[PDB]
Amino acid sequence: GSLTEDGLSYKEKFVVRSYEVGSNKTATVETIANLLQEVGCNHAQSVGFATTTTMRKLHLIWVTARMHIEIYKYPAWGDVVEIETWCQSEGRIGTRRDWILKDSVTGEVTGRATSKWVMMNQDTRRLQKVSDDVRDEYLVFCPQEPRLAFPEENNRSLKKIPKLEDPAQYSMIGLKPRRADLDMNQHVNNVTYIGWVLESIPQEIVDTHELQVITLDYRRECQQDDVVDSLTTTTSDSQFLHLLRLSGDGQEINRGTTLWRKK
Amino acid sequence: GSLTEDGLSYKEKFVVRSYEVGSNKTATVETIANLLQEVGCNHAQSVGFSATTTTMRKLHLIWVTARMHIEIYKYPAWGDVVEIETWCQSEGRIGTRRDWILKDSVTGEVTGRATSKWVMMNQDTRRLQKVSDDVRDEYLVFCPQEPRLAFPEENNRSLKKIPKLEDPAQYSMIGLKPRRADLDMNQHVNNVTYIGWVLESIPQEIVDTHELQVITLDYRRECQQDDVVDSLTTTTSNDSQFLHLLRLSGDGQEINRGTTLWRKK
Ligand SMILES: Fc1ccc(NC2CCOCC2)nc1
Numbered sequence A: 001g002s003l004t005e006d007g008l009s010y011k012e013k014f015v016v017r018s019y020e021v022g023s024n025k026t027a028t029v030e031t032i033a034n035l036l037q038e039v040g041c042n043h044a045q046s047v048g049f050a051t052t053t054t055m056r057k058l059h060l061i062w063v064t065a066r067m068h069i070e071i072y073k074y075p076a077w078g079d080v081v082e083i084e085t086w087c088q089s090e091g092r093i094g095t096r097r098d099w100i101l102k103d104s105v106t107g108e109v110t111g112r113a114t115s116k117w118v119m120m121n122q123d124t125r126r127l128q129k130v131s132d133d134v135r136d137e138y139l140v141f142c143p144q145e146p147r148l149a150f151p152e153e154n155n156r157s158l159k160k161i162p163k164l165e166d167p168a169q170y171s172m173i174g175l176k177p178r179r180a181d182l183d184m185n186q187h188v189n190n191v192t193y194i195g196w197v198l199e200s201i202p203q204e205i206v207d208t209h210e211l212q213v214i215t216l217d218y219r220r221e222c223q224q225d226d227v228v229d230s231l232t233t234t235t236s237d238s239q240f241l242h243l244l245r246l247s248g249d250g251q252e253i254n255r256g257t258t259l260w261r262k263k
Numbered sequence B: 001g002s003l004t005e006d007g008l009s010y011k012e013k014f015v016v017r018s019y020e021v022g023s024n025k026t027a028t029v030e031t032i033a034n035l036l037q038e039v040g041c042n043h044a045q046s047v048g049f050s051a052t053t054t055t056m057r058k059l060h061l062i063w064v065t066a067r068m069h070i071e072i073y074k075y076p077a078w079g080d081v082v083e084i085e086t087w088c089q090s091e092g093r094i095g096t097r098r099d100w101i102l103k104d105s106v107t108g109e110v111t112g113r114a115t116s117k118w119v120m121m122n123q124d125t126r127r128l129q130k131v132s133d134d135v136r137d138e139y140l141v142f143c144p145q146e147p148r149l150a151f152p153e154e155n156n157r158s159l160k161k162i163p164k165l166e167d168p169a170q171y172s173m174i175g176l177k178p179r180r181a182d183l184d185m186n187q188h189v190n191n192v193t194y195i196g197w198v199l200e201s202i203p204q205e206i207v208d209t210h211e212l213q214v215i216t217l218d219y220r221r222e223c224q225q226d227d228v229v230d231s232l233t234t235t236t237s238n239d240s241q242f243l244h245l246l247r248l249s250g251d252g253q254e255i256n257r258g259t260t261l262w263r264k265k
């Protein structure tokens, strides 16, 4: 991979692997989500980071608040997908990371994604606004004019998500992470929550539809010793409302929505 | 990736990804195992098995893993390039073998090696069977004719018999179940998931203070997408050795047995 000519964005090419595809021989949305985090990580490394010097001094880290992905075509096993990524400040609210996915052979846009990140103290887990000190440290690596993967006014990436009401239409209970679900810092990888959300969608929907859009809000982290319940209700194309909560006390960890198109 | 000059083996380079590494910032043994299956798949495709032969498709036969044996000297770090070479060899009518050698791309040093035994099985009845002369002749033209072994040694750990763990187990992880990411393109549980499940019953303190050097896993029965598994481990031993057993949560039907060898960091 490499930074682009202006040094304000980053591109990387990936060849879709045999174990990365589902039963239609195309990349799963979890493989796509892993590729998004890998290209994001390579972008941060390329510009010297993903915490700044002031963030390290104050024990602050970036945490995902929201992930939104729209796929038009899933790349097939053996296909090359090119992913471009960039960051932008959202004032003191936090930061945003966007991605564009393209078919390497045709140059056609096959997907797009956007994510909202908030600053959090590593130890107390207290959310915070971004200080002007940290904003100045990453502004030199971001486009100055707004650049959006989802520019449209009133688009799906900014819609409020309601809380699923019991009883859920579908459920998958007792989900728990194994060591492969953890990241290098021993926290549950953000992509695992995408998998857990999808576990409560009936297999018949998966067999007859393709996932077009997924919006996921992250409220609380699942610990390596926690147990999760995945809940889904049809709200409709087929649309669903999702809720992930702790198996015991019912504490919310995520809420989301999915939109599926008939094959 | 590409077939080598003689067309009897295949090589491919991989850059270790951020989500592929553990707490030491080096590739997990499950990432290594996924890379082994990917290079094996690319080798089959390169020689026209886009991995069953013509006779196998006619007779509804498939290759299934009977045993996987991996030894790692150095796990590649996040961002490192690892080169993997793979080849196949017939083992008469018993089945086939696939071997791998892992190297550090920069130094050319061997950092790991693996070997696997595969048996023929009817896709529908699940009945194991011997390799016919016709099947053997269809893949012999893609294998080295002289024996080529990743574990040539006359007393290697890749061929040792594994006993069945006796209850009570010293350690256990119960109620393990696959999610959609654990399935392969044919909706079967990926062979690498069983490696993860075996490792779930090793205490975290061993993982934090030791590095996994060797893993030998026997595959007896497959876990369905709706089955539930229990992972059992007992210490048998600076080095620490363990005996492992995976069995169905309900009736206790064995799905895998294995051994691991760990060295102190
Ligand atoms: F845009 C991103 C997305 C993820 C990331 N880093 C995490 C993903 C890999 O292991 C843990 C750290 N950085 C930037």
Ligand SMILES: Fc1ccc(NC2CCOCC2)nc1
Residues within 6 Å of the ligand: A018, A019, B036, B037, B038, B039, B040, B041, B044, B051, B098, B184, B185, B186
């Ligand atoms: F050498 C090998 C190893 C595994 C494999 N099987 C593949 C079946 C589809 O999912 C990816 C793995 N083929 C060849």
